[PDB]
Design a protein around this motif. Structure first.
Motif: not given
Ligand code: CL
Ligand code: CL
Ligand code: CL
Ligand code: K
Ligand code: MG
Ligand code: MG
Ligand code: MG
Ligand code: MG
Ligand code: MG
Ligand code: MG
Ligand code: MG
Ligand code: MG
Ligand code: MG
Ligand code: MG
Ligand code: MG
Ligand code: MG
Ligand code: MG
Ligand code: MG
Ligand code: MG
Ligand code: MG
Ligand code: MG
Ligand code: MG
Ligand code: NA
Ligand code: NA
Ligand code: NA
Ligand code: NA
Ligand code: NA
Ligand code: NA
Ligand code: NA
Ligand code: NA
Ligand code: NA
Ligand code: NA
Ligand code: NA
Ligand code: SR
Ligand code: SR
Ligand code: SR
Ligand code: SR
Ligand code: SR
Ligand code: SR
Ligand code: SR
Ligand code: SR
Ligand code: SR
Ligand code: SR
Lengths: 194, 237, 119, 46
Positions: A100-104, A113-119
């Motif tokens: 959900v966070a990546e989309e916002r 463009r989203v590449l990746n994400s982390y907590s």
RNA sequence: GCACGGAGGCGAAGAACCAUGGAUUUCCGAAUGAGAAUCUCUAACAAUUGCUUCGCGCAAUGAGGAACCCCGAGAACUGAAACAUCUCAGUAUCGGGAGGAACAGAAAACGCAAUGUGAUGUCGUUAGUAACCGCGAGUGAACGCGAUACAGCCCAAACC
RNA sequence: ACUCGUACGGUCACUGAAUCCUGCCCAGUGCAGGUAUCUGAACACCUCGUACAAGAGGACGAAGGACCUGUCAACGGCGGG
RNA sequence: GCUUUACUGCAGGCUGUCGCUGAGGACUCUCACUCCGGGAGGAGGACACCGAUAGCCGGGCA
């Protein structure tokens, strides 16, 4: 010898102990006063970011996003349902909060463009994740051998179609054998039973 | 069934809203740095639509024109004071600490600086009983002993318009006019006079609640009607 | 700030940077937190610098204790860009390490001493 | 009513369309205005 | 032009017609200077972004498309001769998004247990088998095999 | 929302101007208060079991209930002999 | 459609527990967090709010 990076990594294996504990206690206070999506000049977890594809280069952006904790936020049924479809409270959603966070984040930066994400932690009422986004239109990236792939047309809005690492895991695509009968090649092609 | 009237209220639709666009102002105390060097002159007495009581327009030294919650006995020309050093007379505002015990007060703040929350209705007044360095004890109009921060500001005297309740409305038309100036749906149709679909008490050959009226504090909205968590009922015993 | 256990006087910080500047012209120096970290690990470092305006702090939180269990002395600099300049960089530097001074061993020595004293 | 300039242009067009199929079209096609409208019997848009 | 009229005109200065390329292309419309039932009012990438010479200077997004595709939200009639688990069904419908196709994909696999196979779709079969289930009604794979097509690589870190 | 509102308020209900009045009943049901003792879930804890886990039992015990009390202008009741 | 001490559930309320959550069977503190204040600052405080779960009530709803 050990990389300096391994030290950031090792600190984050126990975000609740050591100096990291005090940093978080301090930081979250500021984070709680920031918006839903805040662009940041540098990753809070360098080792993780570089590990995920991050580079200190033009066209590479990092943004922290916070989301409300807990399960689903659903409205009870106005029309008749059988006990089974009357559930309201304990029913959770199918996308994890990271997704959900990546989309916002991606909605905030329509062109990236989203590449990746982390907590990056959470408190009792919300969770924070940092997202790496890339500018597919910047030449510094169109010429990068390790990132130019994200410039292809079929990579547009990749996060909204589940093409992210977090997307793929959440879609049960991790396993290549047992257990992935209904996930590969897509949830939809398998009639949505995965 | 259908949602009961009490549930329709919460949506805040026109029918249930107060005619706010017609209201004059919120009689909150002035904010002063300190010193009490703030004084003004009552320039006019006006009617407050929202409280059916009079209010006084005051012109302060520093050029601020504002309406104030008027106690009884305040007239045009009179000078009012607001501060720690303010004089102890009707119409003046100052922290409870500076107020002498045994003095009737009104428009008492709940938390120092909020502007006043207690005793603001027609002819009412709180009674400052005990003093201290940590707690000011006030007796509110309901008779309850309230412990307040001595730093809570208040106005000396009782609220103007007392006795308003002593005269009967006599006719529906009068109630009507008053109700048109409040956030209230009126007239009132009894629960027992409605259909079962509209209220817990609706239905039945003759009118009568088909159940005991004392309802539990835990009852959900839609069911919490009648005598809510009554500790007792009737007049006897 | 969470990794800074003592404040360094503006004047002491002055001498250190100068020493670091001559150290790059004479001896050898390491620029960057990674290179600095390995120096301390390989034991090939005499004095390491650590900016105090590093954000996020994770990048350098390890230098202090890593240095203690390696006997390597360290000092704090207020500005990140000054360390990078003093190190001879066109950019900033979160941490630095004088890998074997150069005609400044006498100063680097005193500096390490003035620090141990400063606790 | 109060018509805007645009409303007026549309009304004008509808009035124009309300004409007969020219006689020569008859000869040429060797043998009706299907969109014939009446102010009373019909209702225009808007 | 459809369209077999009247009048008149164009065409050997090679028209008509056809193919390719170009010109013109009002207003509203994502509609983007502000506003508006297709018009009006006083120079415009409105709004969100990236880069930035920090100036809208250079750029991106927005909306459409028969279905197909991916990610989310997700019924009930119905069947069980009632009905609640189950069924209808992850169907209808809704939100978001890409392409010409999508998605998947180079094993922390398989487990015909092996001295064996060797990325991934898909088709045929394995099979209404294993498994599920008021063990009722019903639901229902996979490995393998035969085919189709085949293709394998790039980072993070160590050392610089 | 009520609410530019603050107990002379406003929310929830019953009765239905004035006038003269409004008896008895708290067992059941409802609401509320109290509660020595009884009963009362999960987590943590203890014993057994398992090289672990499933699991069995124990100790502790919140609201609630048992029990006591208040209450009919609270639901209602005011008979047979 | 409606009712209820019909069956089965679902909201909702009360209550315990775990997380948020810190320092020194009863206690102090302040540093998160909450509230008041224009601000300074004041009040409260590891509670409350919120996430999770457990027991009770639960024709308000299906
Ligand atoms: Cl994206
Ligand atoms: Cl009234
Ligand atoms: Cl095989
Ligand atoms: K059904
Ligand atoms: Mg497919
Ligand atoms: Mg006021
Ligand atoms: Mg009204
Ligand atoms: Mg009535
Ligand atoms: Mg009726
Ligand atoms: Mg009802
Ligand atoms: Mg009656
Ligand atoms: Mg009656
Ligand atoms: Mg005409
Ligand atoms: Mg326009
Ligand atoms: Mg049936
Ligand atoms: Mg049967
Ligand atoms: Mg099925
Ligand atoms: Mg298999
Ligand atoms: Mg390379
Ligand atoms: Mg009547
Ligand atoms: Mg507030
Ligand atoms: Mg029903
Ligand atoms: Na985007
Ligand atoms: Na007409
Ligand atoms: Na054209
Ligand atoms: Na544009
Ligand atoms: Na610009
Ligand atoms: Na049937
Ligand atoms: Na039936
Ligand atoms: Na079943
Ligand atoms: Na075989
Ligand atoms: Na009784
Ligand atoms: Na009906
Ligand atoms: Sr798009
Ligand atoms: Sr107020
Ligand atoms: Sr105010
Ligand atoms: Sr009734
Ligand atoms: Sr009585
Ligand atoms: Sr820099
Ligand atoms: Sr007509
Ligand atoms: Sr192959
Ligand atoms: Sr009467
Ligand atoms: Sr009773």
């Amino acid at each position: 010898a050990r990389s300096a990076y391994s030290y950031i990594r090792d600190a984050w294996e126990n975000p609740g102990d050591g100096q990291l504990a005090e940093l978080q206690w301090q930081r979250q206070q500021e984070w709680r006063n920031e918006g839903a999506v805040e662009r940041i000049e540098r990753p809070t977890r360098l080792d993780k970011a570089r590990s995920q594809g991050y580079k200190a280069k033009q066209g590479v952006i990092v943004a922290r996003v916070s989301v409300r904790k807990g399960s689903a936020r659903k409205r009870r049924h106005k029309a008749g349902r059988r006990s089974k479809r009357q559930g309201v409270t304990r029913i959770t959603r199918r996308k994890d909060i990271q997704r959900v966070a990546e989309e916002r984040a991606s909605r905030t930066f329509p062109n990236l463009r989203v590449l990746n994400s982390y907590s990056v932690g959470q408190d009792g009422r919300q969770k924070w994740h940092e997202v790496i986004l890339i500018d597919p239109n910047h030449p510094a990236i169109q010429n990068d051998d390790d990132l130019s792939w994200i410039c292809a047309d079929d990579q547009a809005d990749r996060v909204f179609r589940g093409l992210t690492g977090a997307g793929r895991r959440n879609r049960g695509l991790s396993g290549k054998g047992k257990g992935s009968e209904k996930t590969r090649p897509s949830l939809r092609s398998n009639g949505g039973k995965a | 069934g259908r949602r009961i009237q009490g549930q329709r209220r919460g949506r805040g639709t026109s029918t249930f809203r107060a005619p706010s666009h017609r209201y004059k102002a919120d009689l909150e105390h002035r904010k002063v740095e300190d010193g009490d060097v703030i004084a003004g002159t009552v320039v006019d007495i006006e009617h407050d639509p929202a409280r059916s009581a009079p209010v006084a327009a005051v012109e302060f030294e520093d050029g601020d024109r504002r309406l104030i919650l008027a106690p009884e006995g305040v007239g045009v020309g009179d000078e009012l004071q607001v501060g720690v050093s303010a004089e102890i007379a009707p119409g003046n505002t100052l922290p409870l600490a500076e107020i002498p015990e045994g003095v009737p007060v009104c428009n008492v703040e709940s938390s120092p600086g909020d502007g006043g929350k207690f005793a603001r209705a027609s002819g009412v007044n709180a009674q400052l009983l005990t003093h201290d360095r940590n707690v000011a004890v006030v007796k509110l109009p309901s008779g309850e002993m309230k412990r307040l921060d001595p730093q809570c500001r208040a106005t000396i005297g009782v609220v103007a318009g007392g006795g308003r309740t002593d005269k009967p409305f006599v006719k529906a038309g009068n109630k009507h006019h008053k109700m048109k100036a409040r956030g209230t749906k009126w007239p009132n149709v009894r629960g027992v006079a409605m259909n079962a679909v509209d209220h817990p008490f609706g239905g039945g050959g003759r009118q009568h609640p088909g159940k005991p009226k004392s309802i539990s504090r835990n009852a959900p909205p839609g069911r919490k009607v009648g005598d809510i968590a009554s500790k007792r009922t009737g007049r006897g015993g | 700030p969470v990794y800074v256990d003592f404040d360094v006087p503006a004047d002491l910080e002055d001498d250190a940077l100068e020493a670091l500047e001559v150290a790059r012209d004479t001896g050898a120096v390491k620029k960057g937190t990674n290179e600095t970290t390995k120096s301390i690990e390989r034991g090939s470092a005499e004095l390491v610098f650590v900016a105090e305006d590093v954000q996020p702090e994770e990048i350098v939180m390890h230098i202090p204790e890593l240095a203690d269990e390696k006997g390597v002395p360290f000092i704090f600099v207020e500005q990140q860009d000054d360390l990078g300049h003093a190190a001879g960089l066109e950019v900033g530097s979160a941490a630095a390490a004088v890998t074997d001074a150069g005609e400044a061993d006498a100063d680097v020595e005193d500096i390490a001493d003035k620090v141990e004293e400063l606790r | 009513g109060k018509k805007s300039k645009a409303t007026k242009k549309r009304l004008a067009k509808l009035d124009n369309q309300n004409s007969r199929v020219p006689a020569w079209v008859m000869l040429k096609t060797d043998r009706r205005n299907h969109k014939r409208r009446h102010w009373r019997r019909n209702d225009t848009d808007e």
